[PDB]
Amino acid sequence: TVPVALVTGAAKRLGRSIAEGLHAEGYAVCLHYHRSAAEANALSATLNARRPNSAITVQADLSNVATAPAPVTLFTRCAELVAACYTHWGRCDVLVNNASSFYPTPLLRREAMETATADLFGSNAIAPYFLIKAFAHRVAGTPAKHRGTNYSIINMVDAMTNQPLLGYTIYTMAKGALEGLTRSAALELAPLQIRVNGVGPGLSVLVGHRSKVPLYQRDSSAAEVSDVVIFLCSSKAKYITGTCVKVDGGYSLTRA
Amino acid sequence: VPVALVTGAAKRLGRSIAEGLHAEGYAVCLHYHRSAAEANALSATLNARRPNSAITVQADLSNVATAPVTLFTRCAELVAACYTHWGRCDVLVNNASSFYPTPLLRDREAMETATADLFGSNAIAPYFLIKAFAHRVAGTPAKHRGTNYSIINMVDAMTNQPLLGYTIYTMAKGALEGLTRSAALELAPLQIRVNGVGPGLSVLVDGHRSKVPLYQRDSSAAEVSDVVIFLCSSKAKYITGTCVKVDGGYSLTRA
Amino acid sequence: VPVALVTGAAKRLGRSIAEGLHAEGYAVCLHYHRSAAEANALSATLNARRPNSAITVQADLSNVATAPVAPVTLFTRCAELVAACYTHWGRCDVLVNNASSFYPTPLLRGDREAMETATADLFGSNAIAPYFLIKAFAHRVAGTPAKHRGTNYSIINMVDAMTNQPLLGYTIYTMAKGALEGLTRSAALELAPLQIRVNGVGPGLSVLVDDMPPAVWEGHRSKVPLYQRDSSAAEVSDVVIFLCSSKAKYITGTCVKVDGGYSLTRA
Amino acid sequence: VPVALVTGAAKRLGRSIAEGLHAEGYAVCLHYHRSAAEANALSATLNARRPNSAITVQADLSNVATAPVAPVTLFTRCAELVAACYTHWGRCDVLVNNASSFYPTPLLRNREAMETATADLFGSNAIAPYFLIKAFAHRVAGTPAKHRGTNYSIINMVDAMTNQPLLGYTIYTMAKGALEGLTRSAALELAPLQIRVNGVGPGLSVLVDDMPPAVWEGHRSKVPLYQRDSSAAEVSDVVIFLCSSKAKYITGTCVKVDGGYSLTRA
């Protein structure tokens, strides 16, 4: 049986490493993207070249805003992403909420305030919520006899948000929401044997903070994070749910 | 005479907090959404005890426009109301909170308003309120600033042990915890303290209470508001970015 | 008149705690290990303000047997501290596990002794003594007929707001503090039926010792987000006192950081 | 061919962990206290599968001095376990602090009992692990850089449920809290030697069934995922993963393996 994985923000960096890892384990992969169409399609071509019909791409803005066709709501856009997996491959075994907007929202010195709120909160928390709902309904709507045997949802959190980055309040809040989503979803979806966990990087693939990481005194590679993600998706991890794993080289253990 | 703004001050915990702060000498701006009668009754009681020690302000803190007026604007206006009437705002208490199911498992705009209401009241409104509050302090010349600025976020001691079916509420509380820490850090330079108070079971609607280790009952409003009040006192000036459980040990239990 | 036992009461945070409780009307049993002169000076001050409101008891809380007053065990020494409260005043309403040894136990580089004594000292003072003290305290309340019990039993464990961001080289100390946090939760749960509340207070930097260059000391305190300084003893003891008040009677099993946001920082 | 020392390896989780590591090619030093028969049986199986891939060492990890052949301290007995790995195979790449005593130490409802309970519960769950880590760390530091292994990993078996204390188990819960502290402090201090230190916290695994079937069923039925306790393998696979080179950026973290049990409330 060939399992399917949906990965948001799959075009590059961690998202792309995650998709590659899942693909190397035999997953067919639905690569979501927002703006990185060229990289997304280039990745699909690589994956489909290795193994025919093992990759597709879907575009979507996951910000908590209406888009033009009545207006399309973020929920609808999310349901469509999950539906694209069932339409093409007839299944969706794994969901990885990786897409994430990250920029300052200082408390100390309108259009910007409102789009920032919906963008940061949508991508990091609200989209993943609706995505999980859509994913869950599909599974519930599948007759028990026909369900997969290893449903796994991974939320990309942040190992460092408890030690807030000065000026990033909304981003930090959204990640805090995502942690709550992880726990609440693990509990409510446990009956459908759908596991929900979180993976929190510290510093990965930076574009003198490296030297602060206790382990290796450097940021991590994408693989050093994606391997963790892949492991949590494996049947060997089927008893793990509702937990967040830090992948930070001990950075969260430090103090100023 | 210090001023305190308390959202959702009309009844229950919000009312207890206002009364507590008032008993310590605070002038209190009582925010309310729908409980206009209860809000005005309380103001009358407080103003009767001490002239000009209470006002009331109506506002929907759901992340939606009204009349268009954005949530941020409505929030700025709440804080402005304090400076307009009394010329100051020393304490902010983000207490207002919507609480109802958002099941993941068995409706179009039903989830739309739920999203904006649950997230607005519990997280986004508090964010804008804190911004507005922080902005007024920063805009106040150092010599004229108060000496005990305190923001309290009402969190939930039990959200790490999620209530089945309440994902969006739980998510909003998680955001509020993040707001508490991020704000404490960024506002430390203005000497504005930001903390959280997390009830377990308090003043139940109407069992579940027999589950509480301590006293085997839910708490009274005072048992929570006193903690809020203490965190606002100058005896607590070194505390910031922390959340205090007031749950009688409920979070220490397991199924 | 309610009684409070405070371990390591002779100076610094322990003294401030005793003074605070004393200012609220508590009679205070001041425990000390080596600071006899400081302890007696404090008792004198408290007894001078209010006759018979203070006493002092000496005890090594390290997890080692002591010279017969058959060797005396740590548990026995702990029971005796609690007993000294009931013997003199007929009661013990509040316990504050404040005493604490603090020094390096590096993982990397007349010798065994230092290893075996460090283990028992750091662990005893910070965790094991508090355990037996709580047991003793718990036993005395349980042995009191309901009709004679106090109405506000409170136990406070002094923890560390920064142990989750370990100080390099202090593994055993950090370990003992983690054990203390465990004790706090387990005790709150088990003693809830006797209405004995058990909480923790975790300082960050308080009355930071200045055995180092002025600038190096400016550095450390400047890392605290709020006020860019370590705290005074009062800024911590007032929190302790509050947790002991009847206005905190619904709080139990919780640890309160008093760190001015220090734990929110990163390297 | 890497070496792994596993304490309390004789049965249950310890055994599953040794088997897991053995299946990955590790040579395994199986520590035991009282389960000599089960320990030797396991060694035989492993050695039969791959010659000279298993040994055993007996040791009481309680924080008490043992009788020789001058009393032996816990630290010495700990160094000797680590030494046994370097003596036999010339290396120790992985350490798994699995050994653990677990029994009640009530505060109420009421000897050499309390002196031994304290030392046994605290020794096995915390103090031994401390000294073992020290010993393990010294051996690595005393190895010239050019000869060091490339994947040093220490895993501490913690408890996903200690923050929701089991009534009457104060000392155990305290020792587990100390073990968590040990995990973080050690990760930090040993980072420079590239020695990773993490924790794995089971919830309910291979739940002891010494009670009415209904009572046993009620207990496991509380676990949200599968409504059952876990198998040993469902825990050991996590341990094994954390030891793999794919996990070489993870350190100072504790991973719950509890099927969501810690998410529940009374």
Ligand SMILES: NC(=O)C1=CN([C@@H]2O[C@H](COP(=O)(O)OP(=O)(O)OC[C@H]3O[C@@H](n4cnc5c(N)ncnc54)[C@H](OP(=O)(O)O)[C@@H]3O)[C@@H](O)[C@H]2O)C=CC1
């Ligand atoms: N890298 C690090 O040091 C850390 C990473 N993390 C988390 O790990 C995950 C991946 O990290 P990283 O690779 O750095 O991520 P990136 O910052 O590179 O962003 C990943 C993708 O998110 C997509 N995205 C952003 N906003 C939206 C939106 N509004 N709608 C739809 N898609 C959007 C972008 O896709 P596109 O280009 O197609 O528009 C982008 O490629 C993230 O969730 C991040 O929060 C956490 C802590 C540290």
Ligand SMILES: NC(=O)C1=CN([C@@H]2O[C@H](COP(=O)(O)OP(=O)(O)OC[C@H]3O[C@@H](n4cnc5c(N)ncnc54)[C@H](OP(=O)(O)O)[C@@H]3O)[C@@H](O)[C@H]2O)C=CC1
């Ligand atoms: N009580 C408990 O057991 C627990 C309480 N808490 C938290 O403590 C705080 C107070 O608790 P409690 O007294 O029970 O709170 P309530 O549930 O009684 O709600 C408080 C007030 O919030 C206001 N409110 C709700 N939605 C909105 C909105 N969209 N815009 C503006 N105001 C709104 C309401 O004001 P109005 O009536 O005027 O419309 C209401 O009176 C809350 O933050 C809650 O989350 C956390 C855990 C447990």
Ligand SMILES: NC(=O)C1=CN([C@@H]2O[C@H](COP(=O)(O)OP(=O)(O)OC[C@H]3O[C@@H](n4cnc5c(N)ncnc54)[C@H](OP(=O)(O)O)[C@@H]3O)[C@@H](O)[C@H]2O)C=CC1
């Ligand atoms: N001050 C700070 O920055 C921080 C403090 N804390 C905690 O707060 C509490 C008080 O802090 P602080 O005032 O600095 O504490 P101190 O370091 O000054 O120690 C307090 C007392 O503990 C006693 N003590 C130490 N070892 C033993 C022992 N083996 N047996 C009996 N008594 C012993 C000493 O009593 P004597 O002198 O009589 O021998 C000492 O006066 C402690 O628990 C500490 O761990 C936590 C984080 C930070």
Ligand SMILES: NC(=O)C1=CN([C@@H]2O[C@H](COP(=O)(O)OP(=O)(O)OC[C@H]3O[C@@H](n4cnc5c(N)ncnc54)[C@H](OP(=O)(O)O)[C@@H]3O)[C@@H](O)[C@H]2O)C=CC1
């Ligand atoms: N199983 C579960 O549901 C849970 C397990 N855990 C943790 O997982 C780990 C393994 O679990 P599990 O397999 O159940 O463990 P066990 O309860 O079976 O104990 C493991 C081994 O520890 C050894 N041991 C106990 N005390 C000592 C001592 N004083 N000195 C030396 N060795 C000692 C015993 O070895 P011997 O037989 O040779 O004497 C025993 O076989 C433990 O650390 C445990 O705390 C945590 C939560 C739940």
